[PDB]
Amino acid sequence: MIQVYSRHPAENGKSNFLNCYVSGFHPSDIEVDLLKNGERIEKVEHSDLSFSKDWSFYLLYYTEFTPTEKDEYACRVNHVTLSQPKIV
Amino acid sequence: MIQVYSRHPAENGKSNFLNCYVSGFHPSDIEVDLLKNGERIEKVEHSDLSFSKDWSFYLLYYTEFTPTEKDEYACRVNHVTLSQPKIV
Amino acid sequence: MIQVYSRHPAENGKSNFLNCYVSGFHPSDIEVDLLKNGERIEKVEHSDLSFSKDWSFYLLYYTEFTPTEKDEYACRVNHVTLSQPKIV
Amino acid sequence: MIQVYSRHPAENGKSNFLNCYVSGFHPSDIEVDLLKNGERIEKVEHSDLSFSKDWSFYLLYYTEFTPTEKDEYACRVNHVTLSQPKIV
Amino acid sequence: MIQVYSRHPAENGKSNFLNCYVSGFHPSDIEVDLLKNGERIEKVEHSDLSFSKDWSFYLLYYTEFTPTEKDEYACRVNHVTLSQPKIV
Amino acid sequence: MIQVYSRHPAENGKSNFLNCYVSGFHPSDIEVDLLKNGERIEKVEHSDLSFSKDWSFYLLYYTEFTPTEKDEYACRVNHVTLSQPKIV
């Protein structure tokens, strides 16, 4: 029983990894305005400019939270497994 | 029983990985305005400019959350498995 | 029983890893304003400009939090496992 | 209000003349501009003005470079005269 | 208010003349600009003006570099005259 | 209010002339600028003006560098004259 694993790659260049995993709440480039340039305005009342309310990543009420999760977050992954079982 | 695995690639160049995985709430390039340029305006009242309400990635009420999940997030993945079982 | 693992790669270049894992609440490039340039304004009242309310990453009410999770967060990962069991 | 008074009255024999041998990368008199004269501009986003990325005169992969050359660069220039008199 | 008075009246034999051998990377008279003259500009974001990244004259991978050359650079220039008289 | 009075009246034989052998990386007269003249600008963010990154004349990987050369650089220049008289 012979099991041979040979790996010798040549990477002739530079490697660049950016923003491998992005998730969650990330809004961007949002502009909200009221009366940006205002001239001769008699009255402004009851202006409501609220971007967001309460923030909570995990909100649970009377909950049974039992997840079984195996995860692997990365940019470059190498997984190699050699098995040579012998049973008599 | 002979099991041979030979891998020797040549990568003649540079590699660029960007934004491999994007998910979630990410709105962009949104503009909301009221009376951008305002001249001789007698009255502005009851203006409602709210981008969003409460934020919550996980919201569970009386829930049984039992997911069994194996996941692999990456940009470049290499998975190799050699098996040579012998049973008598 | 012979099990040989040979790995000798050549990386002819520089490696750059940036922002491997980003998550959570990260909003950016958001501008909210009211009456940016204001001239001859008689009255401004009841202005509400609140970006966010209470912040809480984990909020649990009457909850049983029992997750079984094995995770591996990284930029570059190398996982190698050689097994050669013998049973008689 | 933007007022620009730019004048380039006189040029005599500006560049690249009376040369025996010219080669390589020599671009000249190239102008790249975005919003050269701008007034009351609200938002400029995501502008890419990269001229070039990589400069490599010799880039060889698994190559056998054996050029044989005999070159004689013998130019002869006689009685060159450049005159730019200015009288005020 | 921006007022600019720029004048470049006289140039005589500016560059790259009477040369026996010119080679390599020699770009000239290249202008790259963004919003050269700007008034009342609110937001400038994410501007990339990178001219170049990497300068490598000899970049070889697994190469056999054996150039044989005999070169004679013998130019002859006689009686060159440059005159730029100015009278005020 | 920005007022700029810049004048460059006279240049005679500026650069790179009467040279026997010129090579390599020699860019000249390159101007890169962002918002050269700016008034009442609110926000400038994330500006990249990197000219270059890495300068390597000889970059070799697993290379056999055996160049054989015989070069004679013998230029002859006679009676060069540069005159820039100024009378006020």
Author numbering:
A (entry chain C), B (entry chain A), C (entry chain E), D (entry chain B), E (entry chain D), F (entry chain F): 6 to 93
From the study:
We show that the aggregation of each variant in vitro results in fibrils that are polymorphic, which contain different numbers of protofilaments and different numbers of β2m subunits per layer of the amyloid fibril structure.
The majority of these (69% of all data) describe a side-by-side 2PF arrangement, termed ΔΝ6-2PFa, which we were able to solve to 3.0 Å resolution. The density for ΔΝ6-2PFa was of sufficient quality to allow an unambiguous atomic model to be built for residues 6–93 of the ΔN6 chain (which constitutes residues 7–99 of the wt-β2m sequence). This model shows that the amyloid core of the β2m subunit is a hammer-shaped fold that is delineated by the single intramolecular disulphide bond (Cys25-Cys80) for which we see clearly resolved density in the structure. In protofilament #1, the termini are oriented ‘upwards’, i.e., away from the hammer motif, whilst in protofilament #2, the termini are oriented ‘downwards’, i.e., they fold back and pack alongside the hammer motif of the originating subunit. The upward orientation of the termini in protofilament #1 exposes a polar and charged surface that protofilament #2 can bind against, permitting the side-by-side arrangement observed. The ΔN6-2PFa and D76N-2PFa structures have a very similar structure. Firstly, the”termini-up” conformation of protofilament #1 presents a peptide segment (residues 15–19) that allows the formation of a binding interface with protofilament #2. This involves both polar (residue N17 interacts with Y66 and Y67 in the adjacent protofilament), and charge-based interactions (including a salt-bridge between K19 and D59).
